[PDB]
Amino acid sequence: GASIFRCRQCGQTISRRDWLLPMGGDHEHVVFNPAGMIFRVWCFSLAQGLRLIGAPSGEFSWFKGYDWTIALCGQCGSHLGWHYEGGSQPQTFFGLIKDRLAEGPA
Numbered sequence: 380g381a382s383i384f385r386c387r388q389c390g391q392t393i394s395r396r397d398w399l400l401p402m403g404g405d406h407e408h409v410v411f412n413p414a415g416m417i418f419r420v421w422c423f424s425l426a427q428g429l430r431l432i433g434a435p436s437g438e439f440s441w442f443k444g445y446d447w448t449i450a451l452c453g454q455c456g457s458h459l460g461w462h463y464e465g466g467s468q469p470q471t472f473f474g475l476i477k478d479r480l481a482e483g484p485a
């Protein structure tokens with residue numbers, strides 16, 4: 380019905396509703412970057428079709444204990460969110476910008 384998440388700009392397969400991850404009790408986190416941009420972030424245990432840019436950085440990380448790398452759509456290059464690593468339980472996860480994805484059938 381609506382179990383697959385694709386890149387909104389090009390349709391690249393990214394994630395699934397089954398792979399949503401409740402972090403802090405909720406898979407949705409609203410955050411701001413240092414430029415004041417608001418993001419409605421959904422946390423996923425797993426994702427595909429991305430391209431992770433650069434090396435991890437902990438600066439300004441919204442999630443305690445985690446370092447982030449920019450995650451672009453591997454197909455069109457749109458900024459879809461961030462990959463997080465270096466933490467504990469889980470050690471890694473994806474934070475994806477909800478409004479840059481499109482939900483649909485398998």
Ligand SMILES: COc1ccc([C@H]2CCC(=O)NC2=O)cc1
Binds near residue numbers: 413440442447
């Ligand atoms: C270009 O400067 C920056 C620096 C950091 C950020 C994001 C990265 C992800 C995160 O967890 N927290 C942030 O604030 C956005 C833009």
Ligand SMILES: [Zn+2]
Binds near residue numbers: 457
């Ligand atoms: Zn794309």
